[PDB]
Amino acid sequence: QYSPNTQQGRTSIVHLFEWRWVDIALECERYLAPKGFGGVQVSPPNENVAIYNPFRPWWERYQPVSYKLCTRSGNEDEFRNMVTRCNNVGVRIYVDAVINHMCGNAVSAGTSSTCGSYFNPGSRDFPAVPYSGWDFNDGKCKTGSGDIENYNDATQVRDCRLTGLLDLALEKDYVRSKIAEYMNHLIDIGVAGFRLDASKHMWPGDIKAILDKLHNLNSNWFPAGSKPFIYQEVIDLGGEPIKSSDYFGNGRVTEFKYGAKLGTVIRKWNGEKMSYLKNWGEGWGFVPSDRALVFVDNHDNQRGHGAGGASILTFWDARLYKMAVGFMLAHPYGFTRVMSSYRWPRQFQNGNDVNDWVGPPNNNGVIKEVTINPDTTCGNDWVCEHRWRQIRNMVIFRNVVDGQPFTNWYDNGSNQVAFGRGNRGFIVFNNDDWSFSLTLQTGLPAGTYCDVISGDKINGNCTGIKIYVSDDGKAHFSISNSAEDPFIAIHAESKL
Ligand SMILES: [Ca+2]
Ligand SMILES: [Cl-]
């Protein structure tokens, strides 16, 4: 459950948030495979409520109606085609499994669903599963509202409705079995693992009982006895009774402290400074590295109201964001997930974005295709952060340095820092309001290296900055605080 099941030497996943299956299939073939990406987190592939007020928000996909593989991203045939095509080029698929709940209890009954299945939230009737009132936690929840009211009570957090979402009775073998039926359908299709949505809202032992029903991965693509990768979405920023360590027997956990603190450090909030990152990892109160799924932002919190609130860095903060993502991808802590987003008309009123509900780019509710521009960026309002040179090249950096120790740390006591990954890579950051210019020990073999942030190694030359490492392992680095990207990264495969 802890191993990602990526190909050896592929070390990240990318969240292709709200992408259609056909576009992901193409992306696997044309980009993710050649550029060394390990896999893709897909949006929930099961049927959800079609919500028209507001118009088709992203969050409708976190309100299940059934386990039919029938969504705005595509149908079952399209989903299977994507998984096959991606696996055939060695890029894995991880499913966002929405298994704590069905839809909101106040959603109107009918067939306003992505596959047209009937459902009746008021009567607890989801006949396409099927679930009935016997399958929800109405009777078990002890709060006066039936919803979660107080996160200091670990029981209600699990047994009551998260903001009114009908809460499945996950102690029941029937319910566990319907969820496992869905998940095993997906495993047998070829998926490599799962994000378990809303894991804080499930008992560790109920998750374990579901996981005990899961198959090993499809043996046409994976070695015998391969377990699905499991990463549990548990928001644990401290100060609540529920700790993500309670979930370690099931799989990895999302470490939301990671992006929250990296954001405060890079924004220099409350006197924080990059020099403090020397002991990044468990020293900052994080989970063990071998249980962490790390990320700068996720699909929730990039809208500003998630775990981390306002500190979270996103594509909107492109310059600082690239730096944060770069630090993450260079540092050995955790298994890394890169976000890939769409643009929306973000409109702040009184410090909050009133358009944070807006769904993916669409024509009358039909999600737009991802178009690829000649410069390799995307059109149709897809941001495609994973195609930004500075991010894609750091995904590659992480592959190149895989397994190498954190070493050769330098800092100036402020925001100019550097470190290496054994003898395979070195990275240098300047987040101070003045220039960096210093000779540093890099740990690398002598030679000329292309900076993969400002450029690329192409046809035996560098298109950007070149760094010259001497016989002693030392190299001079110069980074103005006015640089487009105030960080430089070099590695064994960027050597000329
Ligand atoms: Ca629950
Ligand atoms: Cl997440």
119: helix, coil or strand?
Answer: strand
Token pair of 408 as six digits: 């050769």
Residues 6+ apart with CB under 8 A from 356: 303, 304, 305, 344, 346
Please pick, among 27, 233, 236, 300, the residue that the annotation labels catalytic: 233
Token pair of 161 as six digits: 């409705």
Say if residue 380 carries a ligand binding annotation: no
Domain limits of the chain? 2-403, 404-496
Contact, 14 vs 28, CB < 8 A?
A: no
Say if residue 23 carries a ligand binding annotation: no
Quote the CA–CA distance of 286 and 292 in Å, as a whole number. 8
Angle ∠(55,59,61) on CA atoms, nearest 5: 100
Output the CA torsion 136→193→42→167 (10° steps).
Answer: 10
Side-chain-side CA neighbours of 60 within 13 Å: the count stands at 24
For residue 286, what is the DSSP state? P
Question: Resolution limit in angstroms?
Answer: 1.1
Angle ∠(58,179,225) on CA atoms, nearest 5: 110
Token pair of 88 as six digits: 């055939």
Quote the CA–CA distance of 421 and 213 in Å, as a whole number. 39
Helix (H) or strand (E) segment spanning residue 293: strand 292-294
Token pair of 11 as six digits: 């070390």
Q: Percent helix, strand and coil across the chain, each rounded to 5?
A: 30, 25, 45
Q: How far is the CA of 412 from the centre of ligand 2 (A)?
A: 34
Q: CA nearest 24: which of 96, 58, 74, 65?
A: 74
Question: Residue 14's beta-bridge partner residues?
Answer: 40, 338
Chain centroid to CA 365 = 25
Q: How far is the CA of 298 from the centre of ligand 2 (A)?
A: 6
CATH architecture, domain defined by 404-496: Sandwich (2.60)
Residues 6+ apart with CB under 8 A from 53: none
- Residue in the structure block whose two tokens are 């007020």: 53
For residue 136, what is the DSSP state? B
Quote the CA–CA distance of 150 and 144 in Å, as a whole number. 11
Say if residue 337 carries a ligand binding annotation: yes
Say if residue 298 carries a ligand binding annotation: yes
Quote the CA–CA distance of 26 and 384 in Å, as a whole number. 14
Residue 493 designated active-site: no
Chain centroid to CA 491 = 25
Q: CA nearest 201: which of 151, 237, 251?
A: 151
- The DSSP code sequence of 29-80 is IIIITTTT--EEEEPP-S-BB--TTTTS-GGGGGSBS-S-S-BTTB-HHHHH
Please pick, among 60, 197, 456, 485, the residue that the annotation labels catalytic: 197
Residues 6+ apart with CB under 8 A from 424: 400, 401, 404, 444, 491, 492
- Residue in the structure block whose two tokens are 């839809």: 103
Token pair of 328 as six digits: 């993450």
Residue 197 designated active-site: yes
Quote the CA–CA distance of 288 and 335 in Å, as a whole number. 11
- The DSSP code sequence of 170-237 is TTSHHHHHHHHHHHHHHHHHT--EEEETTGGGS-HHHHHHHHTTPPPPPTTTS-TTPPPEEEE-----
Say if residue 100 carries a ligand binding annotation: yes
Output the CA torsion 389→390→391→394 (10° steps).
Answer: 110
Helix axes of 76-88 and 173-189: crossing angle, nearest 10 degrees: 50
Of the listed ligands, the closest to the CA of 162 is 1
Quote the CA–CA distance of 403 and 424 in Å, as a whole number. 10
CATH architecture, domain defined by 2-403: Alpha-Beta Barrel (3.20)
Of the listed ligands, the closest to the CA of 308 is 2
Q: How far is the CA of 145 from the centre of ligand 1 (A)?
A: 15
